[PDB]
Scaffold this active site. Structure first.
Site: not given
Ligand SMILES: [Zn+2]
Length: 259
Positions: A1-2
């Site tokens: 994930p960012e």
DNA sequence: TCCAGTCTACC
DNA sequence: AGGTAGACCTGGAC
């Protein structure tokens, strides 16, 4: 994930675990770094007093120490309320449960196990993984003036610099690709060749892109302008989006709208 | 077959 | 040093 997904994960767990007290911790496996057995003994009876985020790390705080959770490339953290029968049905990648005094379950899932669950005893700001990180992209400290100045002695592609956690945290492959397109800058531009006006645009595009993603987080859909759109039309000129390899990372851009 | 965060390691 | 590549591991898209 960012960073948008980590911030959205943070906002999802906090109202569900903060006031509460830990009663047990289930460890179906023990990632990039090993987990600590007897983490349950460590956390049992200890109230959560805060959750937080720094860069792409989540932080779960007690009066005795800090739990740091990183999702890596495929990790998830989810809450199951006591009435939710999915508590009884974990899959093979649901490596860790953190069970609260009330029955609430926080479940960590991570198929490739690039994430991390680490328990740390000292001052948050001095952790080896957090100490040397650069500024938050959504803070005032990430400004045009800083960026233009930080970039003067860097000859490297700006995409490398923009994905460098020492320059700014949280700008991963997706949102660096999207910001560079939206700001009109080739990912191959030497970082020290961005003009001051160009660094100001790149800064505000990062902030806008990341903020809109935090709030967002059969019919035609298209989240992205260039990312994952190799050989499909550019939304601005209609020309074909190219994908190249830059710094071992998939790099998508339009050479017509980005110089 | 190859595609999809960051810590370690070498020239 | 800066610049490079390898290391971790598993699921799904041509
Ligand atoms: Zn274009």
């Amino acid at each position: 994930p960012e960073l948008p997904e980590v911030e959205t994960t943070l906002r999802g767990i906090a109202p569900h675990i903060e006031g509460k007290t830990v009663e047990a911790v289930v460890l179906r496996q023990l990632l990039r770094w090993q987990i600590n057995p007897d983490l349950g003994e460590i956390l049992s009876g200890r109230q959560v007093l805060s959750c937080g985020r720094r860069a792409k790390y989540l932080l779960i705080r007690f009066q005795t120490g800090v739990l740091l959770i990183h999702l890596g490339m495929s990790g998830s953290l989810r809450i199951f309320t006591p009435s939710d029968g999915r508590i009884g049905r974990p899959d093979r990648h649901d490596h860790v449960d953190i069970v609260f005094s009330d029955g609430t379950v926080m479940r960590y899932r991570d198929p490739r196990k690039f994430g991390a669950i680490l328990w740390y005893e000292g001052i948050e700001e001095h952790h080896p993984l957090l100490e040397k990180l650069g500024p938050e992209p959504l803070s005032e400290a990430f400004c045009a003036d800083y960026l233009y100045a930080r970039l003067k002695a860097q000859k490297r592609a700006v995409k490398l610099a923009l994905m460098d956690n020492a320059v700014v945290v949280g700008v991963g492959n997706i949102y660096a690709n999207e910001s560079l397109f939206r700001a009109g800058i080739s990912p191959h531009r030497p970082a020290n060749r961005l003009k001051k006006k160009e660094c100001a645009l790149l800064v505000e595009t990062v902030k806008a892109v990341l903020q809109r993603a935090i709030e967002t987080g059969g019919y035609f859909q298209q989240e992205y302008t260039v990312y994952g759109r190799h050989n499909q039309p550019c939304p601005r000129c209609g020309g074909l989006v190219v994908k190249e390899t830059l710094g071992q990372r998939g790099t998508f851009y339009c050479p017509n709208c980005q110089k």
